[PDB]
Structure 1
């Protein structure tokens, strides 16, 4: 029933930061650039278009700001833009010097569908180094009430929110340039009062290092305020009597850069991106201290004035202007991925180290199959022992048949032994896929018994994705161990941790050759539960954000349906770059929500210790995931039936 391909119906809001062509001291010309860009934003289906500080006059005109003809021309141009907006989709946020009471104010005028919703004055006017703003303009901090524009009294002040009544996830707040650089910025109080999209109009003459400063402050605002931050600075056309300009625009969301434009461009530029209002909503739902901070500042935050507007956004397929990683646990960017792998590995190792110290260095018993998970756990166990100054021969590795394993153990210098469970199984199957659980259980039973006998503990090797799907023999089974270093690591990341270890090369070339052989042999269960690439994608969206299934399918389809779009991490030869149809994503998603929400929780409910690894979450019922073991997944399956097309 929803239009599945509509970004607006999935909770996105399309927003634009625009750098126009400045004609200093010519408001009709600045307005014609603005209108042209605003029409491009309309054609793109954008809900918001933010322009540079003092758009209609030029930022850089100093005492010209005070000339009656300049100020009159700004009013005439502004009113003409307002009439134009009757036919434009986006809210426009346009800068203007405007008269109010005794002075002119440096303002952002918020315009929508033929009306002015509000006028927001800059709160802090720098008057130091290259800035002289208090000479021409009055501070807006603490100003409230209304301003008279074109025959209407409209809201004026630095306490205004603009809330889309048909898009509750979109609540706009506006501030100007210096306002975001002070210790207590107006946007931070507005975020706590309910703003989700924070706009900044900037003039910002460019000097060496200044772009880094803008980025630092806008990025950290977006993170600390669990918000999108939409920034536009002035560019070509501002006076270069004493100053230069780079026209930078950028869009941040919760600390992530969604889009940015060319610095020092020839001609106008825009950043345009779909902000996920549900991502912002999900972060604020979970981070309770955000709301405790609002309650601490209740008087400050409860008094904002909320001005309502109806956006009436396009209902159809307008694409999705957003990078959606195929692997939420495996960043495509190589530098970022190296860092993640470094971090995961040390998490795993230091976790195990603390366990070994607290137990006065037991021997470590571990089942090794030659598979990715147990290969990597053995490497972790080895490094933990090395760092604790303990002999590698205190590692007791067991192959348990019902290849690369013995090679790897021999290359590491750990104690390797191979017990054949075939026979004990047989006497079991007699005294009482059955076949295949008896084996799994007898593996575990043995490992524990040897650990008892040898003064050791059992290290587990099962991974987070297996925990998510309940892929595991419950009880006496592979979940059970004294400490599982892989419990927090999703299957999709495991191969990269191994690659990272090989690249490290800190184990020497023989060990690297065996690990490489493991990767080559294992990479090329997924037949029952489907591709781990898709199941790890849904696990992240559910565990981090609680997104509904149709939202997850939509993100997954944009990431995965076309192998040529987007980016792939390192380690994917062209031939190993699969693409998935919506029918496939839908199928594996029905299996995901059933197994995750309903079937699998009981198996997780009694997990072994092991460290949390991913910022996306782990599944410890002592930690990130508290849930009932006895619930149906009916509503999630029904949501898929209702909202995700069959193909």
Structure 2
């Protein structure tokens, strides 16, 4: 495959256009529309949506009832169709059309020189500033065909336009008022299989109406797990009694993909790349979506599929989509503040409940002065506080084996816990002898068993101290560690009584500590020590030198855990997010010296290591996993929760797919 073709990774480029209305002049509306569609063609778009009653103007009132206007609309529409023979995108053009007795408010769905369909507006508003049932007829329940340019084409509120070469691209078209009713045609359509929901809108602008437009469009994209395309009327509509801002916007599953200047001077587009695979995946996993479709089986099987071949460009056309470098760490400072709040509080509260259950025991914790331990200790302190329990019931322990520990003791004494040292070294010596390891005879062999003796002894001592003094062993291994198997399983740091860092990726612990210093509720000196830890630990490096940088691994982990995306898709997404340090945004707290940019070769390498460790090696360590709360919306790794997977499975197909699809550089 061409790795850099957005289309070949499941994307589909869509455009929401606002054009220059020339009320009463259909030929000039068709001119503006043709020019913008030709732009969409140059941009590689597959879809282009224009505003309500595009070809005549929405605001012309009883001028819709004049035969000369309807005739010019027909002529301009046929010109448009003929011109669309050389245009890539599917044009969705509003128009007042003649059928049976009346004129209906229709969107003509045009493609490659033919009319795929004609959708009538379903609910014509007749209230306040709207007088639509005067001039036009409702379409709710109209099926059959309509005759347009010597051809009988599908007509009704029950169409679907499915791309035969892009199965993720299945189009449905409603109009303005349609999406504001309790049961919108688009919802049925989505259950019926529509993935891109289009809305043509005239929408006279008003104080607070753009807010309502966004509310309903976003809510639609989320509830229907689909993409939503909205286009409103702009410059040219009669200002006899209304004004027009020409807003266009593109939503996808609740997230604004793009939007355009309000009240512009001149035509505007919103062009974006819709990840059909993200929709596919959200729908694969949300059983209740298909359950809802089944409950409404009769309503949903009555849709008609009009198949068409899009044949998109197969080359490099960029990616009109903002792939954030940190799926777990939003780069918008306000959103990151909210995220850190939520994470920190769910950790504290999960620990609080575990503590209340056990008659308020003690909290035994081994603190190394690194990030995860620091944060876990902060968490336990707050949990104990909110429960009105002495901080002296927290028992921090520095357990040296064979510079950073000073952070740990400074922090422990600042917080007010019970600090203590236990030099496991001698117990390690004894054990290494009793098993006959070369180090007890004096040859420096620092293999795995050497290091695991110390790790397991730290955990062993903590467990026995908990048993002796009546407490519980708080864990500190974080989500990215679980995803990679970067722990000692069993007798080791993997085991504990209640891990509060279990659901937190490594990349978000840094910002949780930054958040705690910012909130600074523990005190000034405590902020000083925490800040010290932050500056000390970043310049983890040891950890990230065998499993790769956690920025790239949390990127891959998010893609896998949330979407199950194949390796090639993760490589493409990571390369667009990370390959350039200047492009895209960075979250707060990243000095320009700690703002790296990774290459495709690096992404490919760490992706190989990731698929190997996550699908295959590491699973068994998560399989027997202490309790602890889920944090991110990307998921957790509990086998009693978000990740049910086998312990004895190989990652051959993932490595093989990387081999076949991801280029070496």
Q: Per the shorter chain, which TM-score range?
A: over 0.9
Which of 558, 564, 584 aligns to 1:566? It is: 584
* Local SS of the residue matching 1:575: coil
* CA deviation vs aligned residue, 1:245-288 (integer Å, no higher than 9, x gap): 00000000000000000000000000000000000000000000
1:123 matched to 2:122:
yes
* CA deviation vs aligned residue, 1:102-127 (integer Å, no higher than 9, x gap): 00000000000000000000000000
Matches of 2:37 and 2:600, distance apart in 1: 34
Quote how far apart the aligned CAs of 1:44 are: 0.2
* CA deviation vs aligned residue, 1:367-417 (integer Å, no higher than 9, x gap): 000000000000000000000000000000001101100000000000000
* Local SS of the residue matching 2:400: coil
* Local SS of the residue matching 1:86: helix
1:422 matched to 2:425:
yes
* Local SS of the residue matching 1:259: strand
Quote how far apart the aligned CAs of 1:579 are: 0.1
* Local SS of the residue matching 2:173: strand
* Local SS of the residue matching 1:162: strand
* CA deviation vs aligned residue, 1:517-558 (integer Å, no higher than 9, x gap): 000000111010000000000000000000000000000000
| Segment drifting more, 13-22 vs 427-436 | 427-436
The number of residues matched between the two structures is 646
Quote how far apart the aligned CAs of 1:491 are: 0.1
* CA deviation vs aligned residue, 1:33-85 (integer Å, no higher than 9, x gap): 00000000000000000000000000000000000000000000000000000
Matches of 1:538 and 1:192, distance apart in 2: 30
Matches of 2:424 and 2:20, distance apart in 1: 77
Matches of 2:594 and 2:394, distance apart in 1: 35
* Local SS of the residue matching 2:593: helix
* Local SS of the residue matching 1:499: helix
* Local SS of the residue matching 2:71: helix
Matches of 2:642 and 2:611, distance apart in 1: 18
Matches of 1:27 and 1:102, distance apart in 2: 22
**2:565 alignment partner in structure 1:** 547
* Local SS of the residue matching 2:627: coil
Matches of 2:619 and 2:592, distance apart in 1: 37
Matches of 1:235 and 1:191, distance apart in 2: 28
* Local SS of the residue matching 2:559: helix
Quote how far apart the aligned CAs of 1:428 are: 0.4
Q: State the superposition RMSD in angstroms.
A: 0.3
Quote how far apart the aligned CAs of 1:7 are: 0.1
* Local SS of the residue matching 1:416: strand
* CA deviation vs aligned residue, 1:346-381 (integer Å, no higher than 9, x gap): 000000000000000000000000000000000000
Matches of 1:559 and 1:363, distance apart in 2: 44
**1:451 alignment partner in structure 2:** 466
Matches of 2:476 and 2:490, distance apart in 1: 15
* Local SS of the residue matching 2:503: coil
* CA deviation vs aligned residue, 1:167-219 (integer Å, no higher than 9, x gap): 00000000000000000000000000000000000000000000000000000
* Local SS of the residue matching 1:6: coil
Quote how far apart the aligned CAs of 1:152 are: 0.3
Quote how far apart the aligned CAs of 1:613 are: 0.3
Quote how far apart the aligned CAs of 1:439 are: 0.2
Matches of 1:567 and 1:619, distance apart in 2: 28
Matches of 2:423 and 2:450, distance apart in 1: 15
* Local SS of the residue matching 2:86: coil
Matches of 1:109 and 1:13, distance apart in 2: 21
* Local SS of the residue matching 1:104: strand
Matches of 1:114 and 1:235, distance apart in 2: 27
Matches of 2:520 and 2:99, distance apart in 1: 69
* CA deviation vs aligned residue, 1:83-113 (integer Å, no higher than 9, x gap): 0000000000000000000000000000000
5+ long unaligned stretches in structure 1: none
Quote how far apart the aligned CAs of 1:333 are: 0.2
* CA deviation vs aligned residue, 1:572-631 (integer Å, no higher than 9, x gap): 011111000000000000000000000000000000000000000000000000000000
Which of 582, 593, 607 aligns to 2:611? It is: 593
Matches of 1:165 and 1:395, distance apart in 2: 63
Matches of 2:155 and 2:424, distance apart in 1: 79
* Local SS of the residue matching 2:545: coil
1:628 matched to 2:646:
yes
* Local SS of the residue matching 1:13: strand
Matches of 1:171 and 1:537, distance apart in 2: 29
* Local SS of the residue matching 1:585: helix
* Local SS of the residue matching 2:311: coil
* Local SS of the residue matching 2:310: coil
**2:440 alignment partner in structure 1:** none
* Local SS of the residue matching 1:530: coil
* CA deviation vs aligned residue, 1:126-168 (integer Å, no higher than 9, x gap): 0000000000000000000000000000000000000000000
TM-score (norm 1): 1.00
* Local SS of the residue matching 2:21: coil
Quote how far apart the aligned CAs of 1:479 are: 1.1
* Local SS of the residue matching 1:459: strand
* Local SS of the residue matching 2:177: helix
Quote how far apart the aligned CAs of 1:434 are: 1.4
**1:3 alignment partner in structure 2:** 2
5+ long unaligned stretches in structure 2: 436-447
Matches of 2:14 and 2:564, distance apart in 1: 24
Quote how far apart the aligned CAs of 1:481 are: 0.5
